[PDB]
Design a protein around this ligand. Sequence first.
Ligand code: HEM
Length: 396
Amino acid sequence: AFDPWDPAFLADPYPAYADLRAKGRVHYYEPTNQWLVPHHADVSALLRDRRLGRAYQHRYTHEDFGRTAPPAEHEPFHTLNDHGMLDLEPPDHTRIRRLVSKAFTPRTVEQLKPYVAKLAGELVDRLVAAGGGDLLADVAEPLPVAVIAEMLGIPESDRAPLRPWSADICGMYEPPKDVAAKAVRASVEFSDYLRELIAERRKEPGDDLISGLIAAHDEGDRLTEQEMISTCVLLLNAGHEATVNATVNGWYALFRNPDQLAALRADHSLVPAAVEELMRYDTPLQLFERWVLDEIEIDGTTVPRGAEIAMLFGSANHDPEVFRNPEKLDLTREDNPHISFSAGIHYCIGAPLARIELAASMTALLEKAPTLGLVAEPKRKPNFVIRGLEGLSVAV
Ligand code: HEM
């Protein structure tokens, strides 16, 4: 009896998650032909199970897996997608991630802190100067793209087309004939830009990540041109909308919980714990899927090879067997093992950088806009897999 399109579910899905959890540990959903998993223990376990993957073609033809191959007109998208580590399974995943993690390191993250803090400060100053604005458009949206641009080493000169590129490519996962068109178009355009920067970095080495990707090697193993383009597009696409919606989701929760906002404003040392609790309370990434590569059993229920599982991260983050009073926002929550950055081999390689951007944004807002208030009830985007608002009207 579940309709993820119901406007009440889009407004507040957490009561329905409560019902799902109470009704069982795996539920077949005919409309999407998917098996829904809502408990934290099950989601955690399945993300670490070697019998599940974000791809199946390394093991089975589409046809042997009981599926239909995608249009060859979408080859440029599928090529760019299938060389990024998010949709790779071992041993290809292992190789590209071991290689990428030689260029993209803890030192790389540390080096961005000053630019993250600087940029955050500037953004909030401008909003303060205007005495208010749209937290999404003016503060949340600009920072993530800029940080990845900076890490990749791209001029503010040519940084304009990145958002619209990332937008149209991601449109493919949201699929209209028109969406598909721009998505392949952007996939080509963006990949050519990358292709270019890859060479003027080969004949002209730099200190950026594109240059660290060109250098990265191990056991004489190295990255292909496509693996590098795919990695760069993945880092922008993965590090943008999630970070944006965590900042706006967080501030909306803070405005709706004035006791917690006042606690935060009174003790800025809560910022790290606050970033984590606001993500558990209302994660922007509600849902992730896995193919069943070998038959599994969940709670004595057999899920067959060829099935697709939907992991409800939102449900898992409100599981009362893990969190006490999960429906309550508590920035001082001691016990917060939220799964928002996932688990197993696809565990977010960006999580340290994401946490530095969310902390820098929050600290700037608290220091520079300590009187910030919500002007209007925001409009919720009609989407149950990426949970977000159209914008956030604020005033000092
Ligand atoms: C609020 C911020 C973020 C959240 C909640 C988030 C969450 C996640 C999740 C859940 C996954 C795995 C999905 C799955 O298991 O199916 C993932 C993967 C990934 N994330 Fe993030 N992420 C965030 C920010 C970022 C940032 C800033 C970057 C990069 C700069 C990034 C890069 C990636 C990459 C490259 C992967 C693929 C990892 C792999 O497949 O091995 N993410 N992220």
